[PDB]
Design a protein around this ligand. Structure first.
Ligand SMILES: [Mn+2]
Ligand SMILES: [Mn+2]
Lengths: 195, 211, 290
């Protein structure tokens, strides 16, 4: 605030980037929290060509705290740097993450869908996330299924109504009869929420 | 050496056909026309056939504008029922472009031969991206594994990027000096062997071919 | 009839102990849940294996921030949720509440400190006495510890147990045939199962502790080959590095308590088995305190 973005960017930005690769995850999340701050005081192009891939790098991090911090920061960036920019930069990496074999990356994807969908606009949200979210419902891991149910419950009211009914209702009906108890409970809760 | 010996004059008949057929002023065939021919709702193999057959006559310098359309639309060549001559002439044109326009042609060709189910599939495979990880070129659509022309293309790409990666990481370790050479040699041997193993597994008949 | 349980989980995450009646109801529910579990609890492959916690509650929250919040992350705790810590009651209550609420998404195995005598000596009994003014909560919890499964079995390959092997145990069927609903004896199968350690040794050996045995590399090799196990996960011993492979990658000791009595300074680690058993250890340091 007192030095200005120009001097810090010329001076401390490479050091900040080097710190972002630190071993201690607490240091990394300390670096993470300022991406909305840096984003507000800096243009979209320079952040896109310097730190966007770095922001994506945190999403695949081992520690869960790092991943959720990056997820919240992605929410901040999309509400700050616009919508079509996120479609050009952020959304392809999220879709790539949806194909990951490891389940935790898919859960990072579902949390990303949760945070983005609130401020990603109705049309973009449906026509991008919904094919991605719906395919994830057939995953063998029960964790994935109940997280899909929770995600549909959360991003329910924010999308279009015809698509809401026609897409969400059959798969939630499918999840209600799924054998795992948690999937049953969360699918029932989602159906009650949607009404 | 394959690209260089490709440039070597064989008989000079190509120059004769250049001076004879290209004088027709049928050079109205343009990259936009070829792109339109590719993007027909039916396959319409006749128009693309005539255009690319004409492009074989073009010298390498003036064939640079057609690099974008040929590479971008080569994914469409993987579909069933494409004539062999289309792929053969695409192979010839790609070899010519490689002789004069190698690096960016390789970048765009790898970007084009992505699986396409992931659509963009991280189209940011720049020159450095392939130069650090040569095995990316093997991460391609399964249909090329039984498409001999584009498979030959991919093999050229793989050899080039293996050598490129060798020189690249040598230069990188030199500039980052400010032992590691043993790790360099081990990484290179591992990378070459891994490429060989992937190719050998490609040679295997799949279960469908087994069926 | 589950909103109260989520409220308890939320309350426990802020390190606020439940009342005696709440603990009684929780122990009743847990007993009605644990009785339907075999001594060798089958566990699906995607699971985060965690070692000892020993009541270091803030470090348990550190572990949760590392590996994620349940039920979104499957967990598997190999005993020692009590003693050697100032927040044993909160830790064990949170783990039991998670077990009741999300029985499929978390598995808790019996430790060697899950015993009446060990709790009486090493200060879980004293902590219960201070935090509740009586021994009723300690009685309820120590009754529950009899029902905790002795071992686990991740995807039929990874064998998770708190302690080591036993000279009289050389088959998973033997472990399944044990009567776990009892106090940890001073000898015999389950005592060794909970108290034994590996060692750079040939054959068996009397443990430096007062119970169990020390088994060499050949023992673990024969056990693994006979039972078709690739790895024997274990958590009974301290590890400065956080985790430590043993016996040519046949046994790995996982310690999930950063520090051990807030003085050892050891690191911690948790194994993370993914959807195809591609393991990965996530080490972490003790969380900052006031
Ligand atoms: Mn122990
Ligand atoms: Mn212990």
């Amino acid at each position: 605030e007192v030095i200005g973005i120009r001097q810090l960017s010329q001076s401390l930005l490479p050091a900040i980037v080097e710190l972002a690769e630190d071993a201690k995850w607490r240091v990394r999340l300390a670096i993470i929290e300022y991406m909305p701050l840096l984003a507000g005081q800096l243009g979209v192009e320079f952040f896109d060509e310097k730190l966007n891939s770095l922001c994506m790098a945190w999403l695949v991090d081992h520690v869960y705290a790092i991943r959720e911090a990056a997820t919240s920061n992605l929410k901040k960036l999309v509400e700050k740097f616009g919508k079509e920019w996120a479609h050009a930069t952020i959304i392809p990496k999220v879709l790539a993450m949806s194909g990951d074999p490891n389940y935790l990356h898919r859960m990072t994807t579902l949390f990303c869908i949760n945070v983005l969908s609130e401020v990603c606009g109705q049309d973009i949200t449906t026509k991008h996330m919904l094919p991605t979210v719906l395919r994830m419902a057939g995953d063998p891991v029960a964790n994935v299924r109940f997280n899909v149910a929770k995600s549909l419950q959360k991003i329910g009211p924010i999308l279009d109504n015809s698509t809401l009914q026609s897409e969400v209702k059959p798969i939630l009906e499918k999840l209600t009869q799924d054998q795992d108890v948690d999937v049953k409970y969360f699918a029932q809760e989602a159906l009650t929420v949607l009404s | 050496v394959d690209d260089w010996i490709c440039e070597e004059e064989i008989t000079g008949t190509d120059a004769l056909l250049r001076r004879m057929l290209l004088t027709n002023n049928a050079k109205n065939h343009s990259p936009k026309q070829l792109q339109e021919a590719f993007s027909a709702v039916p396959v319409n193999n006749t128009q693309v056939m005539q255009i690319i057959e004409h492009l074989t006559l073009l010298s390498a310098s003036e064939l640079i504008p057609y690099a974008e359309v040929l590479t971008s639309n080569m994914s469409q060549l993987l579909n069933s029922g494409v004539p062999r001559r289309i792929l053969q002439t695409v192979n010839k044109l790609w070899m010519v472009l490689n002789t004069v326009m190698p690096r960016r042609l390789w970048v765009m060709t790898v970007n084009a031969l992505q699986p396409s189910i992931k659509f963009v599939r991280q189209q940011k495979y720049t020159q450095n991206d392939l130069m650090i990880d040569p095995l990316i070129v093997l991460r391609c659509d399964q249909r090329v594994h039984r498409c001999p022309p584009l498979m030959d293309i991919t093999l050229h790409m793989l050899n080039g990027y293996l050598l490129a990666s060798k020189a690249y990481l040598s230069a990188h370790l030199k500039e980052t000096e400010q032992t590691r050479e043993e790790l360099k040699n081990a990484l290179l041997a591992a990378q070459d062997s891994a490429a060989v193993q992937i190719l050998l597994e490609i040679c295997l008949p799949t279960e469908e071919e087994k069926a | 009839f589950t909103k109260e349980l989520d409220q308890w989980i939320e309350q426990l995450n802020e390190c606020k102990q439940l009342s005696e009646s709440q603990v009684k109801s929780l122990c009743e529910k847990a007993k009605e849940i644990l009785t339907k579990e075999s001594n060798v609890q089958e566990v699906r492959c995607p699971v985060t294996v965690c070692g000892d916690v020993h009541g270091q509650f803030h470090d348990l929250m550190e572990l949760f921030r590392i590996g994620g919040k349940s039920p979104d992350t499957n967990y598997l705790f190999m005993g020692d949720y009590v003693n050697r810590g100032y927040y044993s009651v909160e830790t064990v209550t949170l783990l039991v509440a998670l077990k009741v609420r999300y029985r499929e998404r978390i598995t808790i195995l019996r430790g060697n400190h899950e015993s009446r005598q060990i709790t009486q000596v090493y200060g879980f009994y004293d902590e219960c006495l201070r935090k509740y003014g009586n021994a009723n909560v300690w009685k309820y919890f120590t009754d529950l510890f009899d029902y905790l499964p002795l071992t686990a079995l991740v995807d039929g390959q990874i064998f998770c147990l708190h302690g080591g092997l036993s000279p009289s145990i050389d088959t998973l069927d033997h472990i399944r045939a044990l009567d776990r609903l009892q106090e940890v004896p001073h000898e015999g199968p389950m005592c060794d199962l909970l108290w034994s350690d590996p060692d750079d040794r040939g054959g068996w050996g009397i443990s430096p502790r007062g119970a169990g045995y020390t088994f060499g590399q050949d023992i673990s090799e024969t056990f693994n080959h006979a039972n078709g196990l690739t790895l024997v996960s274990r958590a009974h011993q301290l590890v400065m590095e956080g985790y430590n492979w043993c016996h040519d990658r046949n046994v790995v000791t996982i310690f999930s308590a950063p520090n051990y009595c807030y003085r050892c300074g050891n690191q911690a680690a948790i194994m993370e088995l993914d959807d195809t058993l591609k393991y990965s250890f996530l080490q972490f340091d003790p969380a900052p305190r006031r």
